[model samples]
Target: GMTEYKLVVVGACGVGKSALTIQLIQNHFVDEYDPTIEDSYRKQVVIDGETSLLDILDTAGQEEYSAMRDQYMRTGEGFLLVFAINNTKSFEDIHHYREQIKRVKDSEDVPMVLVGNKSDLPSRTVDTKQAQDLARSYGIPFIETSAKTRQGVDDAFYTLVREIRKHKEK
Candidate 1:
């Protein structure tokens, strides 16, 4: 059976969520757009020999969804917790985001990846080792990405797909 992966990207403002999502779906970067969930993107690809659809939701800057964030988490099959590497505060927000997902899903496992975006930036306030430690604590994969350079973009999104697969296996 074919599956359409519902991958929700949760991050604070200016984390490059839309850029990263567009890069995955279109293979290039594009700046901001409106209507958080309307900006949801669907693209098909074969992963591990199984072709699947990725219905990506990027809700980085939409403060309006702050009230509906729980509903956002409720429907997601997987999550990409994105944070710009240069922004320590954005990285901090990911910790809270994880707990929200866990509480909403009410499961021992919620498919997710701790993604450090904007890796190409010269300033790196959030160290790689620390982020890895956080991901380790959550028992999830930690990946650094640069949507601008298209670096590790696939890994960040695809890893969450594998995470979703694992959760379904249970």
Candidate 2:
């Protein structure tokens, strides 16, 4: 049987979480896109010569209903901490989600990725160097992506899956 990964795409509003996930799940970008606490997605892919299943949760509006946040956070095996590179506030909010997950799971670190989305923007408020430095601080992989262009989108989720395998093996 192939391994199934419980992955989550997490972030603040309008960071293109839906765009990224839908691009991966359905391979179509939503020009504008939300809903229950979270929407679930599934995909089976081959990465690094291994076939695996990805069970993803997009927490579309669950940020406001944060009490339920802990439940999903706990269930997630890996997380994509998404932010919009064109929005400084969106990038700034990534820290809270990263910290909250660790605190909830009581783990120093979990399988995770620091995703800088909206890379297609003409105005890049958040520099790539800054994002990389922050990822270094968290000791996780940092990837830049444009859900619209589909750049680095698969790598973001694939990297998370690899991290889960790397971590879970130990």
Using TM-score as the measure, the top candidate is: 2
Q: How far is 35's C-alpha from truth in model 2 (Å)?
A: 6.7
lDDT of 2: 0.87
Local accuracy of candidate 2 as per-residue lDDT tens digits, 1-84? 678888988888889888899999999998777434467788999989888888898887644456555676777899999999
User: Model 1, 128: alpha-carbon shift in Å?
Assistant: 1.1
Root-mean-square deviation of Cα positions for candidate 2 versus the true structure, in angstroms:
2.0
TM-score of each: 0.88, 0.91
- Tell me the spans in candidate 2 whose CA falls farther than 4 Å from its real position: 35-37, 64-70
lDDT of 1 by residue, 1-170 (tens): 56788889888777888888889998877765543443568889888888998888777544445545556567889988888899999988887877777777885578889999998889899989999999999888999899999999989888899888888897
